[PDB]
Amino acid sequence: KAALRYAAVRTLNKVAMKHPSAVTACNLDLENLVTDSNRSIATLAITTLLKTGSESSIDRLMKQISSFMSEISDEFKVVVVQAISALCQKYPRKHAVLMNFLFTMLREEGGFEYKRAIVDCIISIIEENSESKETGLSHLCEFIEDCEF
Amino acid sequence: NPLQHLEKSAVLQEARVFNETPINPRKCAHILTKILYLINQGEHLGTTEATEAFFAMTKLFQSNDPTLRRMCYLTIKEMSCIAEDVIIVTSSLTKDMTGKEDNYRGPAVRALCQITDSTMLQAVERYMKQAIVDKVPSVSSSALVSSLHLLKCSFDVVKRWVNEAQEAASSDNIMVQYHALGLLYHVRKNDRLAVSKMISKFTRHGLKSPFAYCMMIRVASKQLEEEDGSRDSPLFDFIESCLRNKHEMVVYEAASAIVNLPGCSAKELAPAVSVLQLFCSSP
Amino acid sequence: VLATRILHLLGQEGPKTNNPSKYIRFIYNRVVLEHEEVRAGAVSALAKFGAQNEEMLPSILVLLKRCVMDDDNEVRDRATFYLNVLEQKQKALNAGYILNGLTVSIPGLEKALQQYTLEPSEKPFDLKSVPLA
Amino acid sequence: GLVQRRTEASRNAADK
Amino acid sequence: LEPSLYTVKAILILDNDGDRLFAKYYDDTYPSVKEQKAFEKNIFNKTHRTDSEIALLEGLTVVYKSSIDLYFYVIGSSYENELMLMAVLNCLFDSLSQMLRKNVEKRALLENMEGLFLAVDEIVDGGVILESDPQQVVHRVALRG
User: Fold this and answer.
1) Is-contact C97 C85, C-beta < 8 A?
2) DSSP B45
3) Whole-angstrom distance, CA of residue E1 vs CA of residue B260
4) Distance (Å, rounded) from C-alpha E96 to C-alpha B230?
5) Where are the transmembrane segments (chain D)?
6) Chains that contact B by 3+ CB pairs under 8 Å?
7) Taking a C-beta distance cutoff of 8 angstroms, is the pair B172, B208 a contact?
């Protein structure tokens, strides 16, 4: 049942925000959902795997998300941005790669809610990680040069 | 659509035919269907107009037409909140509930409980108790569900019906068992000892209703959360045993309950996750 | 709305960075290119840099003197206000009127002012009577 | 150095 | 979630324009008819173009099925068992399919609105699932002597 898989993955994605270690048991079943016909389920599975995964899996999973960014709705793009925010908290050493990805998404087409969620994520990374501050402020300065909002 | 251009004033004026004798049961049933359709479309009936239409409908009780009688019960339920003095049908509904026609008894119980206030509930208590223990599943289910609705208005009166509800919970009928167990829980909900004693009784004898199993899993999970989550609890073993149920609904509810339990280990989650994995491939 | 919010952040956090001069170019370029709201936010950000960084103050005073020539009335009035406050070279004025906002509860202030307007006295309204946020 | 800008202002201008 | 017999929040039957043919709300989540119609129109706009059977809309689990010219919705809490809501949706649709002789269409439904009202009243009472077997529902509604 697609609805039951969706409900389970969405709930696991919320658990993975608070208790990522508990969800790690489900990682094998979540990997099978990465190729689901429902792109919403696949996106929730990847974003859950990002929250629960190892630092070594980040570059592989980020590369898979970048291929789905064109096929997913803006609501699911916001869920991807929230997963990146949680990744920056968990793996502060990867902030430069994650900020460059967020900055690339900021240059692409997107609605107000999606652009807001990216800006909010960059601001959160700047507040939590002082080493990211100058780079994040520089990316926000480039964004305001062509900001429609 | 013969109902598309129905105006409230025209239909309420047609309802004056209910004052005539002899009654045409087909014509009157069709007019009641128009009234129900107007209410369902969200047309507001004024209190005076609703009351006049309700008292006009009461005159249809002179007809013995079974379709018209059922449309009267439906109209009583829909107009109960908008018409004044709806208590006027109480004697007719108590008669039909205690009647020989089983097809009237269940609907008559539901209509009676919808119009019965907290002050009149004591007058119908005897008939409600008889309807709960009735052999006809439609009557027993209607009386149990109606008793659940009356719990909001008159908790202390409905609490006296726990014995009759407990007898109905032994029924082989899936819906009667579900409604009886549900009513017993809603009455006992604030008494932790009574809930634990209810769970231990039904875990030992089993349930036949998949709906009653789903509700028992939720009751057991809530009780397990309130008991600081001792995993060696017979409540956890009950929820885990429900993962092997023949009904997909019960298996899913058990898996969802185990997953939402606070402090669950990866070992305790594994069987629930394996069942959810199997459901991801469901057609 | 995003440009003004980023300019406000740059005005608060930019002066606290190791190289605050790096941001001034981007802020000042908004005064030349952008709409009135964004220009007003850019002038406010430049004033915050001048108030926090003494080394930047002479450069900010020249930039604010250019902003006084703005056609928009609110941008010009802001530039005029910040120029005159910064020219006094008083840290207490800069802290009071450029860096630090109101510390009082807004609902508390509204309610206190509403009571004072109903029963006006010969004593001026005292902002210290309002509960702190 | 050639870039296509896809800002909300450029979209609104193109739609106007 | 506190264990409850109250599972169903609403049952909706909308036409292809998103107009209300049948609606019943069992809780105070949408107290006004204006909010109910806004919710119905919002659900319709999000579901009418999608072949998906389940959605999360306004924090509620919406299970739905399309027919020829009708959309059937069963709405529950986001915390409710999605399969329990599907059992209600299937019971409603299969009951109407049997009653309408397999022609589950706007015209046939409007000609037999008395049967629809009676069928829904046999399936759900005050938000409690009363019956899940479509044959039992049809048998209880088929009172035409």
Assistant:
1) yes
2) P
3) 9
4) 47
5) none
6) A, E
7) yes
